[PDB]
Amino acid sequence: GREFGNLARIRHVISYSLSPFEQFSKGIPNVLRRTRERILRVAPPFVVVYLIYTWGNQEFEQSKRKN
Amino acid sequence: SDLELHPPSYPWSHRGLLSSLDHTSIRRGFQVYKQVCSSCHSMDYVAYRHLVGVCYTEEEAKALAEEVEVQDGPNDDGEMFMRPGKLSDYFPKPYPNPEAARAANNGALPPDLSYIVRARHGGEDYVFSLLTGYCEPPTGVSLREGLYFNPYFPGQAIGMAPPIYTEVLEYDDGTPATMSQVAKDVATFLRWASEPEHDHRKRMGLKMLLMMGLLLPLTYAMKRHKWSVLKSRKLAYRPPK
Amino acid sequence: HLVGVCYTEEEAKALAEEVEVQDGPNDDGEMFMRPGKLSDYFPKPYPN
Amino acid sequence: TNMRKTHPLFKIINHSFIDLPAPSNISSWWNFGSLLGVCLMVQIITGLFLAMHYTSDTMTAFSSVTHICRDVNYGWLIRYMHANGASMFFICLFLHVGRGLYYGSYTFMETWNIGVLLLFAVMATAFMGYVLPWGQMSFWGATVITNLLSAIPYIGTTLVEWIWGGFSVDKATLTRFFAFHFILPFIIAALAIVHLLFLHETGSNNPTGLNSDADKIPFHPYYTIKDILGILIMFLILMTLVLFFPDMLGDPDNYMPANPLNTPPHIKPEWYFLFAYAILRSIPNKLGGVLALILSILILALMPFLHTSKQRSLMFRPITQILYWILVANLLILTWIGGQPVEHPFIIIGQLASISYFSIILILMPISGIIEDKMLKLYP
Amino acid sequence: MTNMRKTHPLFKIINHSFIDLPAPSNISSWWNFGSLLGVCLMVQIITGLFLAMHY
Amino acid sequence: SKWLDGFRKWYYNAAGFNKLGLMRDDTLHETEDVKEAIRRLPEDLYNDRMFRIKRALDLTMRHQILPKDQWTKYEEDKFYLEPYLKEVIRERKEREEWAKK
Amino acid sequence: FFERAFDQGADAIYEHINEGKLWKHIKHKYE
Amino acid sequence: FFERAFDQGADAIYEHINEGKLWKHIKHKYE
Amino acid sequence: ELVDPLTTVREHCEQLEKCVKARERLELCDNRVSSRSQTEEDCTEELFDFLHARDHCVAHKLFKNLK
Numbered sequence A: 001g002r003e004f005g006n007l008a009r010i011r012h013v014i015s016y017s018l019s020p021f022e023q024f025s026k027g028i029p030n031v032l033r034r035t036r037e038r039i040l041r042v043a044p045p046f047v048v049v050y051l052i053y054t055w056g057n058q059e060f061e062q063s064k065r066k067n
Numbered sequence B: 001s002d003l004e005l006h007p008p009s010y011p012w013s014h015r016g017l018l019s020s021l022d023h024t025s026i027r028r029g030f031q032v033y034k035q036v037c038s039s040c041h042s043m044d045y046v047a048y049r050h051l052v053g054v055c056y057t058e059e060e061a062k063a064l065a066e067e068v069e070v071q072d073g074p075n076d077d078g079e080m081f082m083r084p085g086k087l088s089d090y091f092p093k094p095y096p097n098p099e100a101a102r103a104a105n106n107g108a109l110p111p112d113l114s115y116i117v118r119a120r121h122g123g124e125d126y127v128f129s130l131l132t133g134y135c136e137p138p139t140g141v142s143l144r145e146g147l148y149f150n151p152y153f154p155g156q157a158i159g160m161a162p163p164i165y166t167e168v169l170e171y172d173d174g175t176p177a178t179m180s181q182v183a184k185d186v187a188t189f190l191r192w193a194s195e196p197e198h199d200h201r202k203r204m205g206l207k208m209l210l211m212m213g214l215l216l217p218l219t220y221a222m223k224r225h226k227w228s229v230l231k232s233r234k235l236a237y238r239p240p241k
Numbered sequence C: 001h002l003v004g005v006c007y008t009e010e011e012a013k014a015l016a017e018e019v020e021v022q023d024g025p026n027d028d029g030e031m032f033m034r035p036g037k038l039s040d041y042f043p044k045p046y047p048n
Numbered sequence D: 001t002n003m004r005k006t007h008p009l010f011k012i013i014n015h016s017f018i019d020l021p022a023p024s025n026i027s028s029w030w031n032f033g034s035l036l037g038v039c040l041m042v043q044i045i046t047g048l049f050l051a052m053h054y055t056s057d058t059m060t061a062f063s064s065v066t067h068i069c070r071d072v073n074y075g076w077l078i079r080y081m082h083a084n085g086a087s088m089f090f091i092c093l094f095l096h097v098g099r100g101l102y103y104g105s106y107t108f109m110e111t112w113n114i115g116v117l118l119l120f121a122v123m124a125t126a127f128m129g130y131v132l133p134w135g136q137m138s139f140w141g142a143t144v145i146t147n148l149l150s151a152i153p154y155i156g157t158t159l160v161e162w163i164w165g166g167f168s169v170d171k172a173t174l175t176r177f178f179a180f181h182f183i184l185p186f187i188i189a190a191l192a193i194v195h196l197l198f199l200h201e202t203g204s205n206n207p208t209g210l211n212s213d214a215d216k217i218p219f220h221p222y223y224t225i226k227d228i229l230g231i232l233i234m235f236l237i238l239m240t241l242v243l244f245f246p247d248m249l250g251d252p253d254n255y256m257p258a259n260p261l262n263t264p265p266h267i268k269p270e271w272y273f274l275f276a277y278a279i280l281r282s283i284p285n286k287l288g289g290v291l292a293l294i295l296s297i298l299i300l301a302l303m304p305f306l307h308t309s310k311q312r313s314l315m316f317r318p319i320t321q322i323l324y325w326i327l328v329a330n331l332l333i334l335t336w337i338g339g340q341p342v343e344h345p346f347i348i349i350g351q352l353a354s355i356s357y358f359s360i361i362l363i364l365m366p367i368s369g370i371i372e373d374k375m376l377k378l379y380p
Numbered sequence E: 001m002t003n004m005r006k007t008h009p010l011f012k013i014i015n016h017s018f019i020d021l022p023a024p025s026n027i028s029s030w031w032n033f034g035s036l037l038g039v040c041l042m043v044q045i046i047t048g049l050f051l052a053m054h055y
Numbered sequence F: 001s002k003w004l005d006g007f008r009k010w011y012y013n014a015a016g017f018n019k020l021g022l023m024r025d026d027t028l029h030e031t032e033d034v035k036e037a038i039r040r041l042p043e044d045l046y047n048d049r050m051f052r053i054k055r056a057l058d059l060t061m062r063h064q065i066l067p068k069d070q071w072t073k074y075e076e077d078k079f080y081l082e083p084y085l086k087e088v089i090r091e092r093k094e095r096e097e098w099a100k101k
Numbered sequence G, H: 001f002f003e004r005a006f007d008q009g010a011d012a013i014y015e016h017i018n019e020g021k022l023w024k025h026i027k028h029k030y031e
Numbered sequence I: 001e002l003v004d005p006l007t008t009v010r011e012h013c014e015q016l017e018k019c020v021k022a023r024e025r026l027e028l029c030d031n032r033v034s035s036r037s038q039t040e041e042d043c044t045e046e047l048f049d050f051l052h053a054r055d056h057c058v059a060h061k062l063f064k065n066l067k
């Protein structure tokens, strides 16, 4: 039913694809761009988890301290 | 005083990812278990047929089966049939029941040591620290009779006396039986009690590592080929305007 | 298996306590006697 | 004339695995559910071996576990694949559900419902299979969960009577646990078949969330060799866990035999239940606690009704991305608090983290969605 | 409005194999043995489950 | 309204769909109302929309973006599907009002 | 024609990295 | 209003066929 | 007799500053709780501190002496 032949009415689109048998300076700036874009959305949650973990361990060993 | 000390990290001969057990030290700590440490504790899950190829050869380990005089039990005639031991028998239990073990060794149960590395934190380091770290009790604490101070034990009151001291044993391979050597040997053998699988596990470990490092770039290059047919595609839109 | 079929509970208890059945070990380690109960099986004349 | 489109078996294989149109831009996350499928297969294989030399007779059950570890050749290896594959199963399951929450895949309503039914079933099988090796920790977790099930009015009594089967610990309990742990993974496989069948009529989602009918490729040979590579990587990580660090995830206290008279100083299940146990350490009510756990799992099923945004994926939604990442953050906070003793200041961290988790699922994502709606000029 | 029996992704399989499957009218009782064989296999597995899960 | 204008420009830049050459209306989730509004489009806007979607798909297949010179700017972002969408919600709400009465 | 050589190579590098503690290294002492 | 009468009737014809033979018939002199 | 290669080790690095201040405060807790009679105060926490420092020191430099 959902086979090739009734998917979409794509019109006036040209695609060029080489043979696979006929074909790190470029991927390194690409992954640098990806991590630069996503670091501000990913990192501060795990940063504040690390701070809560260290503070909770410090307060637990302080509560174990009998003074 | 419920606070406890975690045992330190010791540079064991099997600490590494591909480091095996000192089988000479395995048989040394086995001898340590046989002549002193089997008086109270038990090994209910270790048999004499596991000692071949690890500690001794086929014959002499079998000879140990005659040195302990295990007893199987009943038959048709109803008497209590004496028989020498064989390789298919487990290690002998010291007490017939736990409450005879508690009554004859001061209320505390000397539990099964086949899984005493795996069932407690730290592992062999905790066993080595508990056996070696016997010190005098400090002030304030007033333990009762038969209870000895040991800071690594939870509650700091271990139910056993220090069993190991100077010249308490001698070895067949000629090793000076000091306290650190006897504790390290019994810790290594008693680590082998929980893991008799260590050498074969690490064998399959490096076999798996070499096979995975061989067969992963092949599938990576195949995926890169069958997707580099797609990633070279450029598309163009030519509307009639 | 005889309760509620041929004998009552006390009759089966009496028939079991008539029978001496092997057990053990105790705290000292001998393989001794006891009068029987319901869970015991029928006594073998010669197991071998 | 060709056998791929006239033979019925090959027609089914071609229609469901070869010529199925798939988006050309799906990341490696879309491998994960397929990994879960073969993860199931691994456990079934080990399950067959655990049908060989396991008895349901408590002391000799633990003795049979030790005999599997020692006497049967490569039996320790099978037991460690079973444990570490349950761990890898829950890793892949959590990342699969995280993919579903992130990339807007919850709009498929019936596939989501089959998924959450699968997730209840697999948590039940994992806990019940944790009971079977019969350690002290498995004993005490079993007693805690059965008493919590008996705390409900006039319903849990017959469940404890059917499950425990007697006045105390007896063999009937472990036989019925082994029976249920045998049976329910096959029901999990059946719901996985229904899961794929309900996915098949609507196509696969791309990470952009757009309609991907413009650019679609056959599943073979692209995603076939991609899933083969994912299977090899998953096998590498699972065998690295088995052959090198066999007990870094497992609780060490499970390996000594169960004694009901003693109380262990720190009851703990495995990590993949621990956050739920954090909810059990959150509120001091029995039936309120059961309602809290059940609603905390069922809120995933209620999540497709809370989608208030006019766009599907979170790829173009930065504020909701921040909200999702602090959601993953405080879920990690719950699964760390769950493996901690009940002392100061773990109680306030656990309670505020549970409250924050419920707020960040339920009430705050609609507000973030209507803020996203307003910042692009579509909200009234 | 759509027909639930012909548009459901799980129920079209069960009605195409069970409900609106066209069968010959003059089938005697002998073909029914085939169906009996199926349910006989099922109860065997059920008894087989009861021969393993308690035993 | 300088507070709202600069924040809207920054949020359009940080939304990310302008980096793959999309308009706003391409990013909408295709419900039945959105699909009906798509069906009412003229042919040229329809062809532009499907080419932009296909370009987005094979741009994010490679995990790359467009060059900065040909990103979709804020001033040229046209709300082409918006009046058809408003018309579709108007007819659907009128139909549900007639069904309620 | 490759897997047995692979197995013995992995085994040989295993006794090369681990010398003086396996059971196969003291075959000369007792037998 | 039939299942208890069903089991009662089946039991009643069972001890009517087997009167004086089952254990409940002889819980007088053997108790 | 056989002298231990442990009592030549855990007293080998007793001269460290943290070790001698730990023993000094151990003498401090000992004589302040010998001064007082009816309290229930225990000197245990810096005993664990001294044992932790000394255990890390002996675990640094033990195993090459043993055979």
Ligand code: HEC
Pocket: B036, B037, B038, B039, B040, B041, B105, B108, B109, B110, B111, B116, B127, B130, B131, B157, B158, B159, B160, B161, B163, B164, B186, B190
């Ligand atoms: C009889 C005097 C014993 C000798 C000989 C050995 N052990 Fe012992 N051990 C004994 C008792 C009564 C106990 C229980 C202590 C209690 O308070 O209940 C123990 C305990 C241990 C432990 C710790 C187990 C625990 O629950 O934490 C270990 C690690 C241990 N024993 C090891 C050990 C070794 C290696 C021995 C040979 C040198 C040994 N024990 C001998 C009694 C006796």
Ligand code: HEM
Pocket: D040, D043, D044, D046, D047, D048, D050, D051, D054, D065, D079, D082, D083, D086, D089, D122, D123, D125, D126, D127, D129, D130, D131, D132, D133, D181, D182, D183, D185, D186, D250
């Ligand atoms: C139907 C197939 C299965 C059978 C027959 C089976 C049987 C068993 C048995 C006998 C045990 C106890 C032995 C041991 O602990 O290694 C066990 C343990 C376990 N099983 Fe399964 N199991 C099956 C499938 C699964 C699945 C699908 C899961 C995952 C949800 C699972 C999770 C576990 C876990 C977590 C343990 C505890 C392991 C441990 O103690 O470390 N099992 N299973």
Ligand code: HEM
Pocket: D029, D030, D031, D032, D033, D034, D036, D037, D093, D096, D097, D100, D105, D106, D108, D111, D112, D114, D115, D116, D118, D119, D122, D192, D195, D196, D199, D203, D204, D205, D206, D300
């Ligand atoms: C029991 C283990 C599971 C298995 C074996 C499984 C299997 C699969 C498979 C094979 C796919 C299609 C490939 C893919 O997109 O990754 C898939 C997709 C999906 N699954 Fe699961 N799944 C499981 C658990 C779940 C759960 C618990 C949920 C609910 C949260 C879920 C919801 C989904 C959704 C929404 C999709 C569609 C995502 C997409 O195609 O883009 N699955 N699953």
